[PDB]
C-alpha cells in the first residue's frame, strides 16, 4: 500500500516532532506498543478509529494530520 | 465520533457524485454491497487499505479525498 506507507511515515514524523516515544503514545492512546511499532513499520492495516485514537494521543488536530499527509503524497 | 461520521459522509458523497450505487461500487472494487453499506453507516472498521481500494474504484485520487474530508471537518 502506497497510502498505508505515507500514513505510517506521517504518524512517525508527527510523533517525533511532538517528542513522544512509541511507549508514551501507547499509554496515551490505549493501543499496545507492538501495534504502534508495527504501524510505523507499515505492517499494520490501521483502521480509521485507530488513526483517530493516535491523533488524540499525539495531540494533533485531524486537519493538521491530513494536511501533512497531502503534502507528503505530493512529494 | 466526529471523524468517523465525516469519513463515511465523504465516501458516500463521492460515490453518489460518480453516479454509483453501493453495489456498482462493490462490483467495481471486488467488495460486497453490505460492506459498502456498513462503511457509510459506521466507518469504525474501515482500514487504510480498504480506503485506498475504494478511492481507486471511485476513481478519486487520494489527495482529493483528503481535501474533501478537510472541508467537511472544517464546515
Numbering used by the authors:
A (entry chain A), B (entry chain B): 3 to 77
Sentences from the paper on this structure:
The most widespread of these mechanisms employs a “controller” (C) protein encoded by a gene downstream of its own promoter, and usually co-transcribed with the endonuclease (R) gene as a single transcriptional unit. The C-protein binds at various sites within the C/R promoter to regulate transcription of its own gene and the associated endonuclease gene. Unusually, in the RM system Esp1396I, the C-protein also represses the MTase (M) gene by binding to the promoter at the transcriptional start site, denoted OM where the C/R genes and the M gene are transcribed convergently from different promoters. Flexibility in this loop is very important for DNA sequence recognition, as it has been observed in the nucleoprotein structures to adopt different conformations depending on which operator site the protein is bound to.
The mutant protein R46A bound with a much lower affinity (∼16 nM), and T36A did not show any measurable binding under these conditions. An even more important role is indicated for T36, since the DNA binding ability of the T36A mutant was completely abolished, as measured by SPR. The ΔΔG for R46A is significantly larger (8.5 kJ mol−1), and that for the T36A mutation must be larger still, since we could not measure any DNA binding activity of this mutant protein. Both R46 and T36 of C.Esp1396I are seen in crystal structures of DNA-protein complexes to interact directly with the base pairs involved in sequence recognition, specifically with the G and C bases, respectively, of the C-box recognition sequence GTC. The T36A mutant structure was observed to adopt two loop conformations (I and III) in equal proportions, indicating the conformational flexibility in this region. T36 is not part of the flexible loop region; it is in fact near the N-terminal end of helix 3 and therefore the likelihood of a mutation at this position altering the loop conformation is minimal. The T36A mutant protein crystal structure showed both the major conformation (I) and the novel conformation observed in this study (III), indicating that both could exist simultaneously in different subunits of the protein dimer. Despite Y37F and T36A only crystallising in the presence of SO4, this anion was not visible in either electron density map. As with the high-resolution wild type structure, the C-terminal tail is also involved in several crystal contacts with multiple monomers in the T36A, Y37F and trigonal R46A structures.
